[PDB]
Design a protein around this ligand. Structure first.
Ligand code: DUP
Ligand code: DUP
Ligand code: DUP
Ligand code: MG
Ligand code: MG
Ligand code: MG
Lengths: 131, 140, 143
């Protein structure tokens, strides 16, 4: 078990948690009410900040059910949460349905957060690859 | 020098997903159905397979690059997350992001790729603030 | 400890770099100027080729700033760069804003590249999840 320090910037939301055992991610809540008309986007506060360990990355993924049912997606998916980042996690939701709005209420689960190792590669410039 | 991934062909008529080259990150998933997507429209497509992602790992459903450029095919929830506990059929939320040309998916077409990666099953520890936790000062 | 070999196919762009220590991605440059009208897409050259090590994968992710501010996205995100690939990295940009075109100039940072280990799992066909001792889990076929 890797530990992850989290601050509830919004104390009124539940702490993100694993929907089932072995699940890859924890769901993030919206701190806000917002309505997305077809094709529109918004940057939604989640009410949390995290300290992803050095050598790791946090990844913000859309939820499948809302994706199919209403066309909810994320413009920068997967969103990359860097180890050094100590601000509020924000989710760039977009409505990809052509005709119907998406209604987001505060306290809805709008995205999921995974933590993974990342290779912090040193780039080494070469003149050519070995053919 | 990795593990196996157990896979069921719920639809025995499709080929088993396979890793085309030894280093390729993903195995391609096929469509079990015919579906036509008009511009801007989406569908939830069955792949005909179920997998058993190992505990401590995750399955990741990513788009194929060719179809993305050639016709604007995308996946609404990309990257799709396949959890270790899930034993249902993998489904792909396809969308046509081209403004004008319909995309026709045929049964047997490759529509996505499935990667498997380790994931950290984190224990969240609530802190009152970062300065007060002893871990503020960063690069950002 | 891991290095990534990289060739600047376009010698007039900087080598990609990490914006801050610990950051997961290096930012990729556009080699070209492109204007994307609402809903249109382009395949944009970055001027670099890389050699992802066997056992790893390169992943091309959108940058959050441009995504939120102008609706810039990547059609096949996350773009998968395989260990066997030695061609130029190309980015399938798309303008998801309904009204405003996006202008990209040569030298702009239009995406970021992560490298991660990948599990090169050996697929084994089984008859069913019950017969493989695998039908006992937290979800079943729910989700
Ligand atoms: O964002 C990307 C993604 C891929 N690529 C390159 C790297 C990679 O290994 C290669 C193939 O990726 P896909 O499998 O996603 N495309 P597709 O399955 O259509 O073609 P192929 O038959 O080559 O696998 O294209 C990029 O340059 N940028
Ligand atoms: O979905 C996201 C993605 C990023 N972020 C925060 C966390 C991260 O470390 C940071 C930067 O992400 P990007 O590198 O994708 N954005 P960009 O390159 O535009 O800005 P920067 O100069 O900060 O890296 O923004 C979010 O809150 N939500
Ligand atoms: O692209 C996908 C994504 C997920 N899935 C399956 C696998 C996964 O374990 C499951 C749940 O995924 P999400 O957590 O993204 N969906 P949601 O949060 O809507 O449903 P649930 O309440 O079950 O978690 O659905 C697919 O078949 N295809
Ligand atoms: Mg879920
Ligand atoms: Mg491929
Ligand atoms: Mg950045």
């Amino acid at each position: 078990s890797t530990t992850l320090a989290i601050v509830r910037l919004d104390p009124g939301l539940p702490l993100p948690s694993r929907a089932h055992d072995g699940d890859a991610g924890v769901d993030l809540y919206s701190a806000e009410d917002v309505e997305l008309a077809p094709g529109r986007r918004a940057l939604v506060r989640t009410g949390v900040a995290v300290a992803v360990p050095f050598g790791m990355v946090g990844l913000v993924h859309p939820r499948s059910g809302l994706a199919t049912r209403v066309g909810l997606s994320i413009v920068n998916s997967p969103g990359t949460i860097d180890a050094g980042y100590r601000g509020e996690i924000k989710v760039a939701l977009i409505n990809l349905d052509p005709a119907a709005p998406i209604v987001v209420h505060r306290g809805d689960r709008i995205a999921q957060l995974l933590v993974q190792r990342v290779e912090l590669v040193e780039l080494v410039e070469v003149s050519s690859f070995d053919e």
